[PDB]
Amino acid sequence: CIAEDYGKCTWGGTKCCRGRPCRCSMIGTNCECTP
Numbered sequence: 449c450i451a452e453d454y455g456k457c458t459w460g461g462t463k464c465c466r467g468r469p470c471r472c473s474m475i476g477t478n479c480e481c482t483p
Contacts, residue, residue, distance in 0.1 A: 454480035 449465035450457050457463060457470040457479055464470060464481035472479035 450481050452481075453483060457481050 450462050451465040455464070459470065459476075459479065468481050468483065470479045471482045
């Protein structure tokens with residue numbers, strides 16, 4: 449899973465471990481996982 453900080457993720461693909469919301473750049477491209 450993505451247990452890294454701000455680790456790149458995908459809406460519907462690899463989600464953040466534990467279940468953390470993934471933020472994006474308001475453009476729906478490089479979404480990083482936020483602790």
